[PDB]
Structure formats: structure tokens, C-alpha cells
Scaffold this motif. Structure first.
Motif, PDB file in Angstrom:
ATOM      1  N   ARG A 145       0.830  -1.200   0.000  1.00 16.42           N
ATOM      2  CA  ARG A 145       0.000   0.000   0.000  1.00 16.42           C
ATOM      3  C   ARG A 145       0.866   1.253   0.000  1.00 16.42           C
ATOM      4  O   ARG A 145       0.812   2.065  -0.930  1.00 16.42           O
ATOM      5  CB  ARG A 145      -0.932  -0.016   1.209  1.00 16.42           C
ATOM      6  CG  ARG A 145      -2.088   0.959   1.123  1.00 16.42           C
ATOM      7  CD  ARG A 145      -2.836   1.016   2.444  1.00 16.42           C
ATOM      8  NE  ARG A 145      -4.223   1.434   2.279  1.00 16.42           N
ATOM      9  CZ  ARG A 145      -5.247   0.594   2.183  1.00 16.42           C
ATOM     10  NH1 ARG A 145      -5.042  -0.714   2.233  1.00 16.42           N
ATOM     11  NH2 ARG A 145      -6.478   1.063   2.036  1.00 16.42           N
TER      12      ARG A 145
ATOM     13  N   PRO B 231       7.778   0.500   0.117  1.00 16.38           N
ATOM     14  CA  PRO B 231       8.575  -0.247   1.094  1.00 16.38           C
ATOM     15  C   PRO B 231       9.832   0.515   1.485  1.00 16.38           C
ATOM     16  O   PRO B 231      10.397   1.266   0.687  1.00 16.38           O
ATOM     17  CB  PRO B 231       8.911  -1.546   0.354  1.00 16.38           C
ATOM     18  CG  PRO B 231       8.894  -1.168  -1.074  1.00 16.38           C
ATOM     19  CD  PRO B 231       7.861  -0.090  -1.229  1.00 16.38           C
TER      20      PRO B 231
ATOM     21  N   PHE C  82      11.635 -13.683  -6.677  1.00 20.68           N
ATOM     22  CA  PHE C  82      11.042 -12.365  -6.874  1.00 20.68           C
ATOM     23  C   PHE C  82      11.094 -11.994  -8.349  1.00 20.68           C
ATOM     24  O   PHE C  82      11.626 -12.733  -9.179  1.00 20.68           O
ATOM     25  CB  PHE C  82      11.739 -11.298  -6.027  1.00 20.68           C
ATOM     26  CG  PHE C  82      13.084 -10.869  -6.554  1.00 20.68           C
ATOM     27  CD1 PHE C  82      14.180 -11.716  -6.485  1.00 20.68           C
ATOM     28  CD2 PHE C  82      13.258  -9.607  -7.093  1.00 20.68           C
ATOM     29  CE1 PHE C  82      15.411 -11.320  -6.961  1.00 20.68           C
ATOM     30  CE2 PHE C  82      14.488  -9.207  -7.569  1.00 20.68           C
ATOM     31  CZ  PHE C  82      15.564 -10.064  -7.502  1.00 20.68           C
ATOM     32  N   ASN C  83      10.541 -10.820  -8.662  1.00 20.40           N
ATOM     33  CA  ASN C  83      10.347 -10.365 -10.034  1.00 20.40           C
ATOM     34  C   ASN C  83      11.246  -9.173 -10.336  1.00 20.40           C
ATOM     35  O   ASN C  83      10.823  -8.023 -10.180  1.00 20.40           O
ATOM     36  CB  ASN C  83       8.888  -9.974 -10.270  1.00 20.40           C
ATOM     37  CG  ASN C  83       7.949 -11.151 -10.197  1.00 20.40           C
ATOM     38  OD1 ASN C  83       8.051 -12.090 -10.983  1.00 20.40           O
ATOM     39  ND2 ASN C  83       7.024 -11.107  -9.250  1.00 20.40           N
ATOM     40  N   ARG C  84      12.466  -9.438 -10.788  1.00 17.49           N
ATOM     41  CA  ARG C  84      13.378  -8.391 -11.228  1.00 17.49           C
ATOM     42  C   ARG C  84      13.011  -7.998 -12.646  1.00 17.49           C
ATOM     43  O   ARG C  84      12.988  -8.850 -13.539  1.00 17.49           O
ATOM     44  CB  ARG C  84      14.836  -8.847 -11.180  1.00 17.49           C
ATOM     45  CG  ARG C  84      15.804  -7.786 -11.677  1.00 17.49           C
ATOM     46  CD  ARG C  84      17.189  -8.352 -11.934  1.00 17.49           C
ATOM     47  NE  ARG C  84      17.273  -9.032 -13.223  1.00 17.49           N
ATOM     48  CZ  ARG C  84      17.942  -8.573 -14.274  1.00 17.49           C
ATOM     49  NH1 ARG C  84      18.595  -7.423 -14.198  1.00 17.49           N
ATOM     50  NH2 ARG C  84      17.958  -9.267 -15.403  1.00 17.49           N
TER      51      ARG C  84
END
Ligand code: ADP
Ligand code: MG
Lengths: 55, 54, 52, 55, 147, 351, 254
Positions: D24, D27, D53-55
Motif C-alpha cells: 500500500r 517499502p 522475486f520479479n526483477r
């Protein structure tokens, strides 16, 4: 159409009055969310201490 | 990295949901305009046929 | 310098607001005398309007 | 949330902890310290691992 | 009628400065704006009483004219001015108290002005004195300067 | 006559957002099967027994069964008395089995008896008419044989003249006063049909019923954003009632525009500030529904009658936030706000 | 009153009940019907009634006649028969919606669809100067009204454009049976379009306005006689109005 007073323009509250797929997806999401809030507000309503002394 | 990967795919997936909702909005505008003319035509015949038979 | 003007600041402040209290009560007696002359015409206009 | 909601059926007993309210607000480094602290003081002493994760 | 003017309610009259009592001074300006509009609602002169048309239009006589004879020679006594003097009385005592800053701090101004005269005297020559510089910079009794 | 009043009924939706008036013409709109006959059966229950003068019921073009459930619900309540001369209700009936020349002269026969009491006597009269759409329709059937070209969608050319010739006798004059409640059938849920959309000029208070509310379970289904009155006026109902009425409609209309976002986003992705104006609006929707008295055989629940001073004080406290600790179900089908918390605890213990 | 050098105003309430009372007379006299059973000359019925409103010149007297017809639509469809006859005859429309009436905007005038084709040539010089920027300011707000429901991650210009559009709207709301003066109207608009309200809370814009108007009637009466009689707003009155709304805004909240 809408770029004149003559043509059809959409108002507020037109997804629920249609009654389609998005009109049914909105009613079952306001209910499945405010069902859990009838749990947390009722479980914490049992924490009145005067009732426990009566218990 | 993951909050950039997510925030760019929210940009694309909200863009194709406005192209497909504007492609659908012209096809219902033609059907609205065929049906708007067809109701003025239909209820004009009922008045003429009501007066001619009288 | 700043405490010399602190003398004179309170002697122009006080004489302004101690005459505002003269005239804020002075308007309170005119608007209750003007409405005294006006109301005594109103309750004799009711009798000038009733019998007709 | 949506990692836990997908894997709630097949792997509901292989979860350690789950961290919600993420994404939201942007980070920061303090939230990378809150997660990494609770990965230690849990009682699970591990020896390898990997992150996806999504690099 | 009668109507007297007033002074400017601009800067001083809303800055009376009580013990954080800006609300009481704000209420003081709020009564002047309310009464000036109530004085602007009604004029100084009321309407006139036509007497001749009253006799013909209300020609059932006796009961109509007897009220018009008693209400014509009546008088309207306005309210008393007993609270008008006591509120103006406390302004006379406070104005004598407001000049106490002009009384007491006037000597405090000249003593500070005379302090600027002697402060020029002390600095003097660079190599002046070991006791004349011992007025501003201090000395004390045994065991004061810790460091 | 020119004077206006307020006649209190006891229904929470009616007295709050669209108050009725003494000597004023009242309309009950809505489709087929939403509650026009029950809501007009409720105002004979509350208003007609506490009223001093007489009362007249004209039934025009409705089911002949329902003229027998009125003759048998007015003997056992003592309004019609079969043994002496102390009755207070007359009845005039022309139903839907009659020829169409007889469903268009019955409403003129109802307001002829009700004109005798207002004129030759001086009492305060009521008048209940159900239905009044069957006065227009029964004249649209004899029309084409009398030799008239039809107008728009099929009505007679003299539609808005003989309607306005009957509706100018139901008035408050300087010899009496006629309160009048009327049920108006709207054909297939379209208020732009030429028969219901010309009665609007003859009505002071309109109570538009709706099928989109009735299919939620909110009963009586009265639309709050479509009901008006001529006395919703802060110089007549006071400034405290006025800023409560518009405070309810503003949070319901702002709830309408929020449903368009939840359909794509969802409920949880909203902010915390408008997760509260939804939850305040949903408690205002449910608090308007009140258990009626003559609908006991449908429900089994008991009949409530909330006074006027309590209806305002119930709605100030949901808006200001004094009941944010209760679920939505604690307000469904209750009377005053006192029973909204007694019903809240009784649900808690069964967990 | 137009023939004798005077001025007038007329209000037809309403013209959509004259086309119905004339259709009944036609179809009972057996005339050929047309669209929605109206006769062929319902355009000729309304045109020769509204064309009698005219601004005469000085050689004939200088009179005038102003005409305001009321027309009731059904479900907001102006593309019907009679709502398109009277639209093409007259000059501009004022379109009152029902959605804005319950959202708090009263009088509920939609300024997105309302026009006037005499334009700015009927405004006084005082009202023309401030409202020319207000019309541009409100029109930039209606472009970005759809970002208000979820907007906090936008540019500071866009946050400013939302901030002025809400506060200009609260100046436009008005209670019933309270008509104002043009000299009081230009002062309230001047307080808003300059920038003297972007720090006041949006709920207080109504309470600030009723306080400010009762001030300048009693304490600045000699400024609202030099905009009524002058007609324009000069450079002397521009500075004189400037410290007035700065004096009131400084000590206001009490
Ligand atoms: N108090 C009530 N609240 C909500 N619905 C009701 C109530 N009373 C009756 N109804 C529903 O209204 C429907 C039609 O009732 P009625 O008023 O007799 O018909 P109509 O309004 O079509 O004349 C019934 O099916 C019933 O379920
Ligand atoms: Mg019925």
C-alpha cells in the motif's frame, strides 16, 4: 454521443442498475467482507466484564 | 524490484481494460441508434393505422 | 527601544477599546428605543386593520 | 497476502509466518528489518534457502 | 432621533490581550456588527398615523376612536441606564493602572540608557586595567569555577 | 385554503424524508407487487381510529377478494358496526369484473359522498383510493369506439383533461379539509408512461416505491432519493429536522457513486476514510426498514410505531458515529434506537 | 411595456403543457398526425411565440422583452420532439440535474452543459473581470473530477486544481429566496479566485461567506457604492478590496 447535451450520458450508480456480471460481483463482495466484521464486532462485544460476573 | 515490477503491470493491465471497454462502447452505440429509430418508426405506424381504420 | 514602545503601545490600545465599550452599549439603547416607537404603531395598526 | 491465499489449499501446513499489509505504502528499510528479525527468533534453525522475486 | 459616532475598530479594539482571552475581545467586536445591522433594519422615524381615514373606514364609532384616543397620547419610556455607568466606571480605574508601565519602566529606560554611558567608559584602552575589566566579566568566592 | 401542517403517522421512512400534511394530497407510486395495498392498509390502521371525523374508502378496479378482506378486517376492529349507529367508515366498490364504462364512474362516486361531509357538514374527512390507474385505463378502452384517433403509446386524446377534472375536487377549501391517500400503479416500472407522469402535478407528497429496494429485504421499499414533499422546509419542520433529512440523502447518494469503484477494485483496497461512509450508509439503509402491524401474518414480528421526536434522534447518532461498534444486523426490522442495542447483545451470546 | 419604452420579463411555466393541450384539440378536429401524434405545425406554434421577444432600438423607444420558458424532460432525454423544438429556437439552456441536487449542490445548475450565446456581452465590467478566470478555473476542475475519489499520488499542480475547484463550488451554493446584489457577488468571487481561501478548510467556506458579507454591508458600505455606480473595478478599488479580505481572514476563527 456524449460531447453534446443531446446524446446519452451515464450517471452515478449505473453498474448496479444494469444487473449483469459486474453488478452481481459487487453485491457478493460487500457481503463477504461485512460478514467478517459481524464476527470481530460481536466477539469483542462479549468482553463486557459485568456480563461475566453475571455468568 | 518487486514493487516496480508490480506497479508497471498495473499500468498495462488497466490500459487494455479501457481499450476493450471503448471497443465495446461503440458497438453498443450503433445498436442503440438502430433501436432508437425503430421505435419512432413503429409507434408512428400504429397511429396511422388507428386513424385509417376509423 | 523595544521596551520604550512597550509603554506607548498600551496607552493607545486602552483608550480605543474603552470608548468602544462606550459606543457598543450606546447602540443598545437606540435600537431598543427605535423599536419602542415602531411597535406602538404596530399594535394600533392591527385595530386599523381589524374593523375594516 | 496473495501468496498465502493461493497456497492455502496445497501447502497450508508448510507455512512459517505470513506478512500482510505490504504494497500500500512504498517499502522501506525498516520493514526489511522487521521481517528479517522475526525470521530468526521463531524457533526454526535452518541451514540453506533461496528467495524468489520479479526483477 | 439621536445617533453618535465612534472610533476605529481596526487594530487595538480587537487586541485587548487578556490572559489568553482573545475570545472575549472577539465577542466585543461581534456586538458592534450585530447592533449596527439592527440599527440599519429600522429607521429613525416610524410611519405616520392617518387619523382622518380611521373615522370613515371604521365608522362603527365609539369603540374604534376610544382606543385611538388613548393610544395617541401615550408615552414610551425606554430602559434604564444603570449598567451604563458602572461599565464606564471600570475604564477609569484601569486607565490609571495602564500608565504604571509609563510610570515604572520610564526610570528603567533611563537606567538602561545610563548603563550605555558607563559601558562606553569601561572598554577604554586595549591594555587598560585588571580591575575595571572586573565588572562585566565576573569573579566569585572560593570554588566557583568548576572547569 | 393556504395553511400547511404536519400529520404524524409513525413510519420511519415517511416522517423523516418526506412528511405528509393535513389536508394535502398524497401519492403512493411503484410497480406491481411491491406493497401499495399494504401501505394503504397501514394508514387505515394508524390514522383512521385516532381521527375524529369520518372516512371513505373507494376501491376502483382491483381484486374482488380484497374487498372482502377489508369487510372482515373492519368488523373485528369495530370500525364497521352491524348492530347500531356508531360506524365511522363508508365503502364504495367497483372492481375489475365490471364493464369498462363502470370502472370510470366509481371514483366520481367515491368523492361525491366525501364531498357531502366536507361541504354540508364541517368535519375533517379522509379518503383512500386504490387503485387510480384504473380510472385512466378504463377510459382508454371505450375511446376508439366513440371515434377518436389515439395519441402516444395508446391512451385517449382527452387524457390530461378528465384526469384534471376529477383531481380538482379533491381539495381543501374554506368549508372543510380532505386528507387523501392514493395508490398509483406504474405500468411495468416506467414513470415516464403518460398516465403516471401527469399525476405528479396534482400531488404534494410522493412516496415512490421501488422493486430494487424490495428485493434486498428492506421493507417498506420506499426510495429515499425519489420521494419529495412541499413542507420539507426549515421554516416549517424546524432547522433540526431539515439538516438531518438532507444529511441522510447526501450520504446515500455518495454511497451510490462508491459502488462503481468496488466493482473493479474491491472492498478492501479502498481507503479507511471511505470504508466508514459505506458502513454508515449501510446502517442507514437497514434502520429505515420497520416491521409493520398488518404484515404480522407475513412476518410473525410485532408492530412498532416510532414517534417523530425519536426518529430524528435515532439518525443523528448513526451519522455522528455513536454506534460504530455494532454490526449491521442490529438495526434490521427494529423500532426505536433503544432496541438496536438490545438486539445487538442477544446475537453475541450464541457464538 | 416594450412598445412604450419600458422593460419587461415573462416566464412560461411551462411550455411542455401547451403542446399537449394543443394536440388534444388537433386530434379531435381530425387533423393528420405526425411524430408522437403531434400535428405538423407544433414548430410553428412555439416559434411565433418566442420570436416576439426583442430588444428594440432608440428610434422606436428603446424597449425590451425577455422570455424564460420552462421545459420538463422525461428521464433527462432532451432528444424528444418538444425538447428539440424549443432548444433550436432559443439561445441557451440552464440544465438542472437531479444527481447534483442530492449531492449538496443547490441550486443544481450543471455548468458543463449550460451555455449562453450572447456571451460575455451582457455582463457588467466588474463581474466580467473576475468571472472570466473563474470560468476557466472551473472548466479545468471538471476535467480532473474523476481523480478525486482515489488521488494522493499526483502532481502538486493537480492537487492545486482540485483544491480550488472544491472551494469555488461552495461559493456557488445558495439558499432559497435569498437573492444577492452584483456588488456583493463580485466581492465573494474576488475572495475566491485570487487565492485567499486555499488554506481554509472546505467545510468552513459557507460559514466564512455569511460572516464576511454581513461585515462589508455595515463596515464597508462606501466601497459597495463605488462598484455599483462605477460599474467597473479600478486600480484604487483593487487595493482597497485587497486589505479587506486580508484583515477579515487574519482574525476570523473565533
Ligand atoms: N409490510 C410489507 N413490507 C414489504 N413487503 C410487503 C409488506 N406487505 C406485503 N408485502 C409484499 O407485497 C406483495 C404485494 O402486496 P400488495 O400490497 O397486496 O400488492 P400490490 O402492492 O401489488 O397491490 C406481497 O407479495 C407481499 O410479499
Ligand atoms: Mg393492490
Amino acid at each position: 454521443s456524449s460531447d453534446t447535451p443531446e446524446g446519452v450520458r451515464s450517471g452515478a450508480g449505473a453498474v448496479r442498475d444494469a444487473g449483469g456480471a459486474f453488478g452481481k460481483k459487487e453485491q457478493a463482495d460487500e457481503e463477504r467482507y461485512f460478514r467478517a466484521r459481524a464476527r470481530e464486532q460481536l466477539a469483542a462485544l462479549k468482553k463486557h466484564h459485568e456480563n461475566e460476573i453475571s455468568h | 524490484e518487486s514493487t516496480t515490477s508490480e506497479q508497471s503491470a498495473r499500468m498495462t493491465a488497466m490500459d487494455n481494460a479501457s481499450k476493450n471497454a471503448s471497443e465495446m462502447i461503440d458497438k453498443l452505440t450503433l445498436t442503440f441508434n438502430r433501436t432508437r429509430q425503430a421505435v419512432i418508426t413503429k409507434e408512428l405506424i400504429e397511429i396511422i393505422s388507428g386513424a385509417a381504420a376509423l | 527601544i523595544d521596551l520604550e514602545k512597550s509603554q506607548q503601545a498600551l496607552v493607545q490600545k486602552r483608550h480605543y477599546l474603552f470608548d468602544v465599550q462606550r459606543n457598543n452599549i450606546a447602540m443598545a439603547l437606540e435600537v431598543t428605543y427605535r423599536e419602542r416607537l415602531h411597535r406602538v404603531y404596530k399594535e394600533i395598526k392591527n385595530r386599523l386593520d381589524y374593523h375594516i | 497476502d496473495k501468496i498465502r491465499g493461493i497456497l492455502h489449499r496445497t501447502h497450508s501446513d508448510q507455512f512459517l509466518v505470513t506478512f500482510k499489509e505490504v504494497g500500500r505504502k512504498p517499502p522501506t528499510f525498516g520493514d526489511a528489518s522487521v521481517i528479517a528479525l522475526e525470521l530468526l527468533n521463531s524457533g526454526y534453525e535452518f541451514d540453506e534457502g533461496s528467495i524468489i522475486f520479479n526483477r | 432621533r439621536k445617533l453618535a459616532l465612534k472610533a476605529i475598530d481596526w487594530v487595538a479594539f480587537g487586541e485587548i490581550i487578556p490572559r489568553n482571552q482573545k475570545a472575549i475581545a472577539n465577542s466585543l467586536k461581534s456586538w458592534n456588527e450585530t447592533l449596527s445591522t439592527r440599527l440599519a433594519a429600522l429607521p429613525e422615524k416610524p410611519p405616520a398615523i392617518d387619523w382622518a381615514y380611521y373615522k370613515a373606514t371604521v365608522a362603527k364609532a365609539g369603540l374604534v376612536d376610544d382606543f385611538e384616543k388613548k393610544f395617541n397620547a401615550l408615552k414610551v419610556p425606554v430602559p434604564e441606564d444603570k449598567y451604563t455607568a458602572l461599565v464606564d466606571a471600570e475604564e477609569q480605574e484601569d486607565v490609571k493602572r495602564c500608565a504604571e508601565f509609563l510610570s515604572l519602566s520610564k526610570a528603567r529606560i533611563e537606567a538602561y540608557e545610563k548603563e550605555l554611558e558607563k559601558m562606553k567608559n569601561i572598554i577604554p584602552f586595549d591594555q587598560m586595567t585588571i580591575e575595571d575589566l572586573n565588572e562585566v566579566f565576573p569573579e566569585t568566592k572560593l570554588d566557583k569555577k568548576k572547569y | 385554503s393556504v395553511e400547511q401542517e404536519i400529520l404524524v403517522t409513525g413510519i420511519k421512512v415517511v416522517d423523516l424524508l418526506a412528511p405528509y400534511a393535513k389536508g394535502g394530497k398524497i401519492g403512493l407510486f411503484g410497480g406491481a407487487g411491491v406493497g401499495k395495498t399494504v401501505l394503504i392498509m397501514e394508514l387505515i390502521n394508524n390514522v383512521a381510529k385516532a381521527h375524529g371525523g369520518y372516512s371513505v374508502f373507494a376501491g376502483v378496479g382491483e381484486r374482488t377478494r380484497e374487498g372482502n378482506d377489508l369487510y372482515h378486517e373492519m368488523i373485528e376492529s369495530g370500525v364497521i358496526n352491524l348492530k347500531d349507529a356508531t360506524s365511522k367508515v363508508a365503502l364504495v366498490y367497483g372492481q375489475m369484473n365490471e364493464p369498462p364504462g363502470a370502472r370510470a364512474r366509481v371514483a366520481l362516486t367515491g368523492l361525491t359522498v366525501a364531498e357531502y361531509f366536507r361541504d354540508q357538514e364541517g368535519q375533517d374527512v379522509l379518503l383512500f383510493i386504490d387503485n387510480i390507474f384504473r380510472f385512466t385505463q378504463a377510459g382508454s378502452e371505450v375511446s376508439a369506439l366513440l371515434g377518436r384517433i389515439p395519441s402516444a403509446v395508446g391512451y385517449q386524446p382527452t387524457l390530461a383533461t378528465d384526469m384534471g377534472t376529477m383531481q380538482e375536487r379533491i381539495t381543501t377549501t374554506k368549508k372543510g379539509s380532505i386528507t387523501s391517500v392514493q395508490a398509483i400503479y406504474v405500468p411495468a416500472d416506467d414513470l415516464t408512461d403518460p398516465a403516471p407522469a401527469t399525476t405528479f402535478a396534482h400531488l404534494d407528497a410522493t412516496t415512490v416505491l421501488s422493486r430494487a429496494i424490495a428485493e434486498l429485504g428492506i421493507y417498506p421499499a420506499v426510495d429515499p432519493l425519489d420521494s419529495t414533499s412541499r413542507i420539507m422546509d426549515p421554516n416549517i419542520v424546524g432547522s433540526e429536522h431539515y439538516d438531518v433529512a438532507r444529511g441522510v440523502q447526501k450520504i446515500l447518494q455518495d454511497y451510490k457513486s462508491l459502488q462503481d469503484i468496488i466493482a473493479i477494485l474491491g472492498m478492501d483496497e479502498l481507503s479507511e476514510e471511505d470504508k466508514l461512509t459505506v458502513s454508515r450508509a449501510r446502517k442507514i439503509q437497514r434502520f429505515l426498514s420497520q416491521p409493520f402491524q398488518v404484515a404480522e401474518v407475513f412476518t410473525g414480528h410485532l408492530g412498532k410505531l416510532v414517534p417523530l421526536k425519536e426518529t430524528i434522534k435515532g439518525f443523528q447518532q448513526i451519522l455522528a458515529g455513536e454506534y460504530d461498534h455494532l454490526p449491521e444486523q442490529a438495526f434490521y426490522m427494529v423500532g426505536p434506537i433503544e432496541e438496536a442495542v438490545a438486539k445487538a447483545d442477544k446475537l453475541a451470546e450464541e457464538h | 411595456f416594450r412598445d412604450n419604452g419600458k422593460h419587461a420579463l415573462i416566464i412560461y411555466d411551462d411550455l411542455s403543457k401547451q403542446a399537449v393541450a394543443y394536440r388534444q384539440m388537433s386530434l379531435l378536429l381530425r387533423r393528420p398526425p405526425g411524430r408522437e401524434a403531434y400535428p405538423g405545425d407544433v414548430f410553428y406554434l412555439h416559434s411565433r411565440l418566442l420570436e416576439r421577444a426583442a430588444k428594440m432600438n432608440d428610434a422606436f423607444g428603446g424597449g425590451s422583452l425577455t422570455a424564460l420558458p420552462v421545459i420538463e424532460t422525461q428521464a433527462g432525454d432532451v432528444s424528444a420532439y418538444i425538447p428539440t423544438n424549443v432548444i433550436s429556437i432559443t439561445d441557451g439552456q440552464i440544465f438542472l440535474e437531479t444527481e447534483l441536487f442530492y449531492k449538496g449542490i443547490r441550486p443544481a445548475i450543471n455548468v458543463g452543459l449550460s451555455v449562453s450565446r450572447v456571451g460575455s456581452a451582457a455582463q457588467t465590467r466588474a463581474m466580467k473581470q473576475v468571472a472570466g478566470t473563474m470560468k476557466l478555473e472551473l472548466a479545468q476542475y471538471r476535467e480532473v473530477a474523476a481523480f478525486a475519489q482515489f488521488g494522493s499520488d499526483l502532481d502538486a499542480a493537480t492537487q492545486q486544481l482540485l483544491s480550488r475547484g472544491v472551494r469555488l463550488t461552495e461559493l456557488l451554493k445558495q439558499g432559497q429566496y435569498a437573492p444577492m446584489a452584483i456588488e456583493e457577488q463580485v466581492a465573494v468571487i474576488y475572495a475566491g479566485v485570487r487565492g485567499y481561501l486555499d488554506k481554509l478548510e472546505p467545510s468552513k467556506i459557507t460559514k466564512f461567506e455569511n460572516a464576511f458579507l454581513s461585515h462589508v454591508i455595515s463596515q464597508h458600505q462606501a466601497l459597495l457604492g463605488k462598484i455599483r455606480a462605477d460599474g467597473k473595478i479600478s486600480e484604487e478599488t483593487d487595493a482597497k478590496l485587497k486589505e479587506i479580505v486580508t484583515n477579515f481572514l487574519a482574525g476570523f476563527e473565533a
